[PDB]
Amino acid sequence: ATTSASHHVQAIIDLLEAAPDADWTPTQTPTVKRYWDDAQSERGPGADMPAILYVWSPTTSSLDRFSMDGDVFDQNDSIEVQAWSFDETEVEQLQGDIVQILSEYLDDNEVQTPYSDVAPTGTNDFREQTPARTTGHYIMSVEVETRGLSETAKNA
Amino acid sequence: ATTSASHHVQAIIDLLEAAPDADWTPTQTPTVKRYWDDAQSERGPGADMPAILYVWSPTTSSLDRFSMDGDVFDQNDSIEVQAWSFDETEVEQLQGDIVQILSEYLDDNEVQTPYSDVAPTGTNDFREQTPARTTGHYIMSVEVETRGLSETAKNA
Amino acid sequence: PDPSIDEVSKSDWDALTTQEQDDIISQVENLSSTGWVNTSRERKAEAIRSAIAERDTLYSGNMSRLPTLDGDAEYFTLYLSAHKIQLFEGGEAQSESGEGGSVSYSTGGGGEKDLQKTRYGRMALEYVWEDNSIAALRTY
Amino acid sequence: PDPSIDEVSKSDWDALTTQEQDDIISQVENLSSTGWVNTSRERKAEAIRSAIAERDTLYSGNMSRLPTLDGDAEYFTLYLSAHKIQLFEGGEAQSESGEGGSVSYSTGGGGEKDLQKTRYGRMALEYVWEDNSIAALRTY
Amino acid sequence: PDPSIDEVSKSDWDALTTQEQDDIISQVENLSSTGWVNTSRERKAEAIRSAIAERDTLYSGNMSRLPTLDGDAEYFTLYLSAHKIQLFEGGEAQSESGEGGSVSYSTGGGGEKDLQKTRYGRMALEYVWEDNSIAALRTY
Amino acid sequence: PDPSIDEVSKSDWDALTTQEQDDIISQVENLSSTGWVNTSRERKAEAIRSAIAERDTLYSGNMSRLPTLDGDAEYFTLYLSAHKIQLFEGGEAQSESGEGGSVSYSTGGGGEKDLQKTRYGRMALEYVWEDNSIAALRTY
Amino acid sequence: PDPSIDEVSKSDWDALTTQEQDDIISQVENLSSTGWVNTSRERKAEAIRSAIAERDTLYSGNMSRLPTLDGDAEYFTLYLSAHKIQLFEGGEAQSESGEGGSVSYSTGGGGEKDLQKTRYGRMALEYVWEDNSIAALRTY
Amino acid sequence: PDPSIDEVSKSDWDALTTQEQDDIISQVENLSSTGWVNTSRERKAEAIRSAIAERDTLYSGNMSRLPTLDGDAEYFTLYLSAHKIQLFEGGEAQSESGEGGSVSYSTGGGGEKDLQKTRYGRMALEYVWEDNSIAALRTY
């Protein structure tokens, strides 16, 4: 229903973009992008613009054999969503928002998503990396995993 | 039947080349190569050419003892297939395709292939690595494992 | 755009409609493959207004009967705008890296002056006798 | 705005309304995509107040009957303000690194003097003859 | 292309049909194996429009009884366009790296002016006497 | 090839059949061990057409009543084509590294001149008096 | 080698049997322990055909009545062929690395010109006076 | 060997038995701690045949009525052969690394000419006045 996306990265982008303007904690709804949509020297928001979420798949997806029949794979996927803003309170609120947005769909039966499970599995704070002397982006992230039965060609 | 090659890399090249044009998702059938067919600065397609697949064996294959006859080895063989294109959606279609194409053969009793099992076992996205300023290759990959019983000539 | 960027001065720029101003901003955004999409409208408008004023002050007038701005004032103003927009973000991107992916852009030190420090500056510099002092005058 | 940064001296700045100061600040904040948003109002106000005072003292008067400030005094005072904010933040980033990834800004060494040390300074420098001394005078 | 890139001025380029303009873009895109496919049509159009403008306004006229452009004006405008597109993409990669493996492209530092800085520029530069001032003239 | 690359000008090249044009392309592909196999037909053809037009324009005329091109015009136009084809992909690779393992190609790097920038260029350069200016003339 | 490489010109090479071409190729292939075996037959034929033509055009005739090709024309044309093959393979390896281990070939930067850029070129260079202009002539 | 390597020219070398030729090759292999065992017979023979021809062309004859080859012609021809055999494989290895075990060989930049580039060349070079002149003539 809410995605029908062909790959996990686009699926999580679609879920974040399907969020109502009421369900974000900040006044302005964030902008959702693939990590590769922006070049490094201009990554993160400018001032007077809404905060940015970058989505990508950071590690190997697994295709376990589900059964002796070979008719389906027990696919497990991983995604990181990073929030960038100049506001240390805003990235904190966005992290909480991403967690309580992507905790819908926690146990789908391919109803909204094309998956059995989309779950936040961990959260990172990187605010300590931002030098205090300059203005600069704070960063925080949600790591989110995704599991589902993915069809094989073996039995046509 | 379809491959009978002496080594796994050529076997998966033969499987990917044997694939019908109707079973690739893009407009035109990709080109299949050894990783070492091309020089680095030339690797990946040029514009107005179909996408390119590079196949190689990335890690040590195991030769496990199958029994105390010593008549045969339980060969476990590793392959990676990289899809290269300028189109961020085409590399995703190629990943989807490579998984379907190589999920036939999933449990040959050496019917088509010279193996018991050819399986996709994982996949990678590397689209996050392509800079946004320059036109350049997106890359995605499928990790494949192959298993079979390989004769020892101990008894001859 | 309906008014081209070379027709209008600083005083004229403030009089423009949002649509006229947006069409000129859109023309500038064509000069970069990323289009500086993370930098706000107001900042690009300020860079253009600056480039227009700077053209009319530093790059008007003559050296002999020749104008100091020899080339097409449209593209000169666009490049001077793009140069300023870049300098509102940072330097030239000499090197960029993230998630292992890395690139480096062959810039070099280039000298000392603002127009020498960016690619849009080094394009703008050819229009204006490369800042050379070829002015010549006599007693009459 | 109602006033402009070139239409006020240090004494006038202190007599502006909060809104008039804030609108000039809002204009200066356009000169970076980052807006210096994590550096407080008082620091931006002080950088402007200093830029106004430093224009009127060091970058005023005549040189061979020309104005020493030949460039647009509006944008000059903005560039001098943006330059000052950037030095209040410790200067130009040469390099940056974090879990966002890493970037380098191509600066090289450059010149020794303050206006040569930041991009806003290098932009201001062209409005004031690149600090050159073409002044000339005769007996009468 | 039936109207060739050297047979059209800026005024003609805006007046071409979509397909004629696209055939010329399709020609320019042949100058890179990467085709600049992830930079949009409008960006490549603006690059060619600017290249035609600089040919007509900076690389036109005479240097003694010679033309200031000595090579084929078709390929000169193509190189000038390719040079502009590459600068819209940030310039030459000196180095690229990732899970594809890594490369470095032997650029050295090179020159300081925009045509010296990029491979398409260095190709165009031979068409224009390497930017030298070889013009000569007499009293009449 | 039956029509050799020196038996054709730009006007002839556009009139060749697919086969006749492909015989020349096939000869050019002998000059690299890789044959540039990832770069499309149209880009190789464009490079050769450019090399032909460049020979006929920038490398024609006498110099001290010797020809400005001393070496075999076949092999010159081939090396000029190979030079251009390389520049359609990038510089010379100074260094290349795959999944594992590495190689570097001892280029070192010449100056701003495109013919110094690649191996085929540095060969073609010997055909054209090393771009030296030995031309001479007298009054009668 | 019933015929041999200095006993033929470009027109003769095209008229040799396949066997006589392949024998001369087989002689050139002795000049590297690696034989350039992973570069195809046609590329080695082309390198020889070019070396023959480049000798006869660029490295022929007299200078102060001395022959310009003073060295043994057989070995000169072989070294010029080996040089050309090595440039078809991308140049001199400065460094090599893999699971075999790693090695570096002490090249430094060296000279700018093609014959200085490879070991086979540096050998051929001694046969032709190191490209020096010994030529001299008198009035009669 | 029965014929020493200084007794025989290029034409004589081709007339030799396998045993005479093998004895000369064996004498050359004594100059290397490895004996170049991975490099084939034909390549070592071609290097010797080249060294003989190159001695007889470039390093025969006289200057100031001294011979240009002053040292023992046997050892000169051996060193010139070893120099060539080395260059058929690659340069001097400045650095080598295997299974972690590593070594580097103190080569330095060394200049530009082929004999300067390798140890056998630097031994050969003393025999032939180090490629310096001492050449003199007078009117009679």
Ligand SMILES: [Mg+2]
């Ligand atoms: Mg210039």
Ligand SMILES: [Mg+2]
């Ligand atoms: Mg200046």
Ligand SMILES: [Mg+2]
């Ligand atoms: Mg030149």
Ligand SMILES: [Mg+2]
């Ligand atoms: Mg030369």
Ligand SMILES: [Mg+2]
């Ligand atoms: Mg010498």
Ligand SMILES: [Mg+2]
């Ligand atoms: Mg000595």
